[PDB]
Amino acid sequence: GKLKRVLSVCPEVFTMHQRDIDRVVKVLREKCLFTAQHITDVLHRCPTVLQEDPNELEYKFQYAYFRMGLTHLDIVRTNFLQYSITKIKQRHIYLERLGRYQTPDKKGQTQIPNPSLRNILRVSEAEFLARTACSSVEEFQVFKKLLDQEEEEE
Amino acid sequence: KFVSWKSRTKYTVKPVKMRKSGGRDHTGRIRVHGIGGGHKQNYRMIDFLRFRPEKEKAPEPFEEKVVVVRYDPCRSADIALVAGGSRKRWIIATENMKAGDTILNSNHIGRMAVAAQEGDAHPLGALPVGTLINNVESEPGRGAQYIRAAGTCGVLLRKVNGTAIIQLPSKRQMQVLESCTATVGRVSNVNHNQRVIGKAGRNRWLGKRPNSGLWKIRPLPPMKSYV
Amino acid sequence: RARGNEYQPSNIKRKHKHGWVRRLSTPAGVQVILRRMLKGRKSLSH
Amino acid sequence: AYEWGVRSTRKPEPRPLDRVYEIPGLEPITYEGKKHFVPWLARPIFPPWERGWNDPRFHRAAPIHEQTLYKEEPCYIFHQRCRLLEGMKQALWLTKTKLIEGLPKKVLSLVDDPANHIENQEQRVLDIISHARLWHSTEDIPKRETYCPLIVDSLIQLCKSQILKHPSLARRTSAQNCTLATTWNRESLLLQVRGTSSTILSAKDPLPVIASREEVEATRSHVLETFYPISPTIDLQECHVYEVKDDTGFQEGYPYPHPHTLYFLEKANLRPQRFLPEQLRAKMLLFAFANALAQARLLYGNTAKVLEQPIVVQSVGTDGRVFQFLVLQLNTTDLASSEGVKNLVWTDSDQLLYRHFWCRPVIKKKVVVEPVGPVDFQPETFRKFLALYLHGVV
RNA sequence: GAGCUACCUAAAAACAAUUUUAUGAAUCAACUCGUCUAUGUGGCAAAAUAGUGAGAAGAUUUUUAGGUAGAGGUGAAAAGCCU
RNA sequence: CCGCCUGUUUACCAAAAACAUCACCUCUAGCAUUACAAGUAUUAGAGGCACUGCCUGCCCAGUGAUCACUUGUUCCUAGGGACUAGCAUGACGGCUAAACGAGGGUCCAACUGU
RNA sequence: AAUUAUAUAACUUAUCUAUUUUAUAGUAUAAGUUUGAAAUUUCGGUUGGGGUGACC
Ligand SMILES: [Mg+2]
Ligand SMILES: [Mg+2]
Ligand SMILES: [Mg+2]
Ligand SMILES: [Mg+2]
Ligand SMILES: [Mg+2]
Ligand SMILES: [Mg+2]
Ligand SMILES: [Mg+2]
Ligand SMILES: [Mg+2]
Ligand SMILES: [Mg+2]
Ligand SMILES: [Mg+2]
Ligand SMILES: [Mg+2]
Ligand SMILES: [Mg+2]
Ligand SMILES: [Mg+2]
Ligand SMILES: [Mg+2]
Ligand SMILES: [Mg+2]
Ligand SMILES: [Mg+2]
Ligand SMILES: [Mg+2]
Ligand SMILES: [Mg+2]
Ligand SMILES: [Mg+2]
Ligand SMILES: [Mg+2]
Ligand SMILES: [Mg+2]
Structure with missing residues (x-):
């Protein structure tokens, strides 16, 4: 069954050259320190990762590992990699500036309970703003444009 | 100065004396830690090519008689002495082998499936799909190398053309030609894992030395701040 | 424990470790003999 | 297929030329x-060397195929x-x-007569056992390689004392370590x-003779039983250089041409070395069958036929404690x-003379549970031993 | 340079009496180790003696020969040991 | 009080609460002629850690309820398709358990030139 | 920490063979890139000795 889902989502897995497949796997192992079983889990769960080039997958993983403070198991369980970087930064940064999110400290503790990752990403934007952040739709649109300008300057 | 003890050139059923290593190479330096001592042991040569026709005999299926089922110090499974014609040889013993039984070694890829009794050796093609097997051979005529441990069995998942898919105990699937022999049934000593060592002295008997007393994701430049 | 007694004599060990046949077995040992011959030693080996 | 013998232990290949x-x-x-090796010159090739005469201490055997007695057909030898x-x-x-299980009725009856009983038979037998196991040696516990031969010689001496009653016993003799052989086809x-x-x-x-012609014919x-898949020649030695x-x-002319009994011992100290x-x-x-057949072939030549006069031979075998008795009758030489x-x-099998012997008393809490000497002595076994010896005279 | 010491290979060896049982059990010699106190301090001794203590059929102790060498070896890790 | 227990260690100032240890847990590996091993996933190597039972066990997509919407992820152009029904949480505490110790303390009796 | 790093591990381009109608296999070597087992070298000054500050 795992092959069936992979074939449907990513028909080119057979067509892709050897080099391309190895790099995606090698990044997950040497640079991301994923275990053997998780590697099979990720490939089956989100086949689109194979299409994605390296040096973008590594950045996305480190964004969660360091900036968001997530752990290996959390990433695998929630299908974090499936989502796009733009969505991750737009939502996470908005919450962080509002003070509703905290990077876990060195000890591993947080003064305030952080919002569940499903609420941050899985839910719709309307529910996410209305419930998780309790903000206004107009403010988010302004923030997205402001964030775009900052990236351009960067 | 180290000389390997594995120098005998002719097959026999007589026990052979073994020399221990200590975990040292032929140079004399430790290569593997945790090995040393134990009880003295004798080696009994096991023949893993089930379908070996006797000298000056044609290649057709033959039968053999089970003389003994015996404990072996060098393995987790138990072995059985089997005699046929004018020849005796050791082999591995399945779960339910008993003394005095007769067993069949076959060379015939039946166009239809051959009824399978535990312990008989048949080419993989003949056996029906889903039949447990052990002592599997990767290549025809090589000799068994997989699934020869105690209580372990494999499964014949599928057959297409002249190639079959086997499910190893680790569950990693594998494929081979259908012209390589295999023997039906699980390996003996199904309850090996249940043992309890009990005291430290028992491990020293088996030839195991104690452990030693002594007690990496690099962030990218944008990750340095929130490390 | 009391030290000073590390020499536990054994003729078989002595001749095998430092003897004539042992010295000639390697080129480094052969050069040991040549140095002692040039100095003039009365005892080339054990 | 796994090959036996790791390469590192095999002799190294010759240097390239x-x-x-x-x-x-x-x-x-x-x-x-x-006339000596140097590293910077070429290695000579020498022709094979011949001494020019024979040195007994350095004799070398010719290969099997060159032996004069080499035969293509194989002969299976039992030793x-x-x-x-x-x-x-x-x-x-x-x-x-x-x-047939059990001894012949005629032989068994020989000892039921109390006239054949030896004086103080039971006591003398007990003494022989104790002497064989304990007294004969200066050591505390003798080993089987000594007492197993000793028990048999002592028992033969006891039975051989019956010449006083029967003067006819002076017509037989005994030899040590004689050899026997026969060739036949099946x-x-x-x-x-x-x-x-x-x-x-x-x-x-x-x-x-034990059995009448009527019993022989019946x-x-x-029908002889078979044991497929095991061949009849399993565990026999296949030889391609043999003589018939x-x-x-004994050589021809021996005054005592009739062998009476054959004795076989299991005197090895270690159990795996004992049959x-x-x-x-x-x-x-x-x-025993070989002894009978060789005697027949000697009298009646090399022809095969049903024998007019059957030949009877006896055999006794022991390891020093358990005894086994055998009587054989040879009726035919056409075995093809x-x-x-x-x-x-x-055949009479597994006859125990005694169960166990203690060389030291068994003491528990300063109480002698078991005294030294034989345990569970069975006098019946000796009578069977005596009966076979007396057969042919009484 | 592994005749000391650390670990390993091969061939050998020792273990009384008593109570339990059926054993890395118990009491306690031989033997192995070294808790505590005093004496000694160019000492009998460059680590001992006198008492007193721990184990003592086991992961026990002991003999003979062989192996691993300094950018290294060995280590039931004390940064211990390798004349 | 500490450590489960018999064991080990700084030869020459430390013998212990340290090290090892049965038990339990994590990671890596589908294979032959010199170690692992003449072995093959109930196997082998590396590492962590007292055991035992006993509370605390939750990132399955939400609501309807095996069914419809809302989500999410994707494409083809705000429209149109594709995918998400071959599965389904977890993380602490107090526990100790009799036995055992030339381990560190407290106490009674006897005993004595302390 | 600075400076290197044919220890391994990967790739890439040549070179040399096979084939193939361009083409995929491999590779006694050379040049790059990625990992880093290791290698060589260093530890400014005044402020008591520190601890935060500073200062030249
Ligand atoms: Mg540790
Ligand atoms: Mg000296
Ligand atoms: Mg030594
Ligand atoms: Mg010594
Ligand atoms: Mg005793
Ligand atoms: Mg010591
Ligand atoms: Mg004690
Ligand atoms: Mg004691
Ligand atoms: Mg004891
Ligand atoms: Mg330490
Ligand atoms: Mg320290
Ligand atoms: Mg020194
Ligand atoms: Mg302790
Ligand atoms: Mg202790
Ligand atoms: Mg030690
Ligand atoms: Mg000390
Ligand atoms: Mg102590
Ligand atoms: Mg001390
Ligand atoms: Mg500890
Ligand atoms: Mg203590
Ligand atoms: Mg008081």
């Missing part, structure tokens, strides 16, 4: 003239160490014989026996076919 040899027309310069996998069943097939198989006897008792007169109904010989144990009971009995049949008149054998 110098490239100067490849070049045609060029004579290499070697160190042969110097002392051979241990038959199938036991008696295989032994019976090889000798074309039928088995269903196209060439078979030979090469063996030895611990002691052999020979008589001046043949033993009485054996034709019996027959040997009773098990069934395998001991199988050895006794073949060794598996159907016809069959030979007959009577």
Whole structure:
């Protein structure tokens, strides 16, 4: 069954050259320190990762590992990699500036309970703003444009 | 100065004396830690090519008689002495082998499936799909190398053309030609894992030395701040 | 424990470790003999 | 298929020949003239060496195929160490014989008469056991390689004392370590026996026949059992360089031409080196049968036929504690076919003279549980031993 | 340079009496180790003596020969040991 | 009080609460002629850690309820398709358990030139 | 920490063979890139000795 889902989502897995497949796997192992079983889990769960080039997958993983403070198991369980970087930064940064999110400290503790990752990403934007952040739709649109300008300057 | 003890050139059923290593190479330096001592042991040569026709005999299926089922110090499974014609040889013993039984070694890829009794050796093609097997051979005529441990069995998942898919105990699937022999049934000593060592002295008997007393994701430049 | 007694004599060990046949077995040992011959030693080996 | 013998232990391959040899027309310069090896000259090639005369201490045997007695057809030889996998069943097939359990009635009756009883028989037997196991040595516990031979010689001496009653016992003698052999065929198989006897008792007169001609003929109904898939020749020694010989144990002209009993011992101290009971009995049949056949062939030539006068031979075997008795009658010499008149054998198995012996008293809490000496002595076994000895006189 | 010491290979060896049982059990010699105190401090001794203590059929102790060498070896890790 | 227990360690100032240890847990590996091993996933190597039972066990997509919407992820152009029904949480505490110790403390009796 | 790093591990381009109608296999070597087992070298000054500050 795992092959069936992979074939449907990513028909080119057979067509892709050897080099391309190895790099995606090698990044997950040497640079991301994923275990053997998780590697099979990720490939089956989100086949689109194979299409994605390296040096973008590594950045996305480190964004969660360091900036968001997530752990290996959390990433695998929630299908974090499936989502796009733009969505991750737009939502996470908005919450962080509002003070509703905290990077876990060195000890591993947080003064305030952080919002569940499903609420941050899985839910719709309307529910996410209305419930998780309790903000206004107009403010988010302004923030997205402001964030775009900052990236351009960067 | 180290000389390997594995120098005998002719097959026999007589026990052979073994020399221990200590975990040292032929140079004399430790290569593997945790090995040393134990009880003295004798080696009994096991023949893993089930379908070996006797000298000056044609290649057709033959039968053999089970003389003994015996404990072996060098393995987790138990072995059985089997005699046929004018020849005796050791082999591995399945779960339910008993003394005095007769067993069949076959060379015939039946166009239809051959009824399978535990312990008989048949080419993989003949056996029906889903039949447990052990002592599997990767290549025809090589000799068994997989699934020869105690209580372990494999499964014949599928057959297409002249190639079959086997499910190893680790569950990693594998494929081979259908012209390589295999023997039906699980390996003996199904309850090996249940043992309890009990005291430290028992491990020293088996030839195991104690452990030693002594007690990496690099962030990218944008990750340095929130490390 | 009391030290000073590390020499536990054994003729078989002595001749095998430092003897004539042992010295000639390697080129480094052969050069040991040549140095002692040039100095003039009365005892080339054990 | 796994190959036995790791490469590192095998002899190393010869050095490659110098490239100067490849070049045609060029004579290499070697160190042969110097008479010693040097690393910077070519290695000579020497022709094979011949001494020019024979030195006995450095004799070298010719290969098997060059031996004058090499024969393409194989001969299977049965000797002392051979241990038959199938036991008696295989032994019976090889000798074309039928088995009857229990000793012959005539022999058994010899000892039921109290006139044949020895004086103080039970007490004297107990003394022999104690002497064999404890008293004969200066050591605390003697070993089997000593007392197993000793018990048998002492018992023969006890029975041999009956010459006072029967003067006719002076017509037999005994020899030590005699050898026996025979060649015969079974269903196209060439078979030979090469063996030895611990002691052999020979008589001046043949033993009485056990079975009448009517019983001999009735054996034709019996069929020899088979043991497929195991071949009859399992555990026999296949030889391609052999000679055909027959040997009773003595050369022609011996005054005592009739062998009476054959004795076989299991004196090895270590258990794995000692035959098990069934395998001991199988050895006794073949060794005794060879003695009978060699005696027949001697009298009636090499022809095959049903014998007018059957030949009877006895055999006794022990490890020093357990005893086994055998009587054989040879009825026919035509063994090529598996159907016809069959030979007959009577066996009495696993007869215990004593169960156990203590060389030191067993003490628990300063109480002597077991005294020294034999345990559970059975006098019946000796009477069977005595009966066989007396047979042919009384 | 592994005749000391650390670990390993091969061939050998020792273990009384008593109570339990059926054993890395118990009491306690031989033997192995070294808790505590005093004497000694160019000492009998460059680590001992006198008492007193721990184990003592086991992961026990002991003998003979062989192996691993300094950018290294060995280590039931004390940064211990390798004349 | 500490450590489960018999064991081990700084030869020459430390013998212990340290090290090892049965038990339990994590990671890596589908294979032959010199170690692992003449072995093959109930196997081998590396590492962590007292055991035992006993509370605390939750990132399955939400609501309807095996069914419809709302989500999410994707494409083809705000429209149109594709995918998400071959599965389904977890993380602490107090526990100790009798036995055992030339381990560190407290106490009674007897005993004595302390 | 600075400076290197044919220890391994990967790739890439040549070179040399096979084939193939361009083409995929491999590779006694050279040049790059990625990992880093290791290698060589260093530890400014005044402020008591520190601890935060500073200062030249
Ligand atoms: Mg540790
Ligand atoms: Mg000195
Ligand atoms: Mg030594
Ligand atoms: Mg010594
Ligand atoms: Mg004792
Ligand atoms: Mg010590
Ligand atoms: Mg004690
Ligand atoms: Mg004690
Ligand atoms: Mg004890
Ligand atoms: Mg430490
Ligand atoms: Mg320290
Ligand atoms: Mg020194
Ligand atoms: Mg302790
Ligand atoms: Mg202790
Ligand atoms: Mg030690
Ligand atoms: Mg000290
Ligand atoms: Mg102590
Ligand atoms: Mg001390
Ligand atoms: Mg500890
Ligand atoms: Mg203590
Ligand atoms: Mg008081």
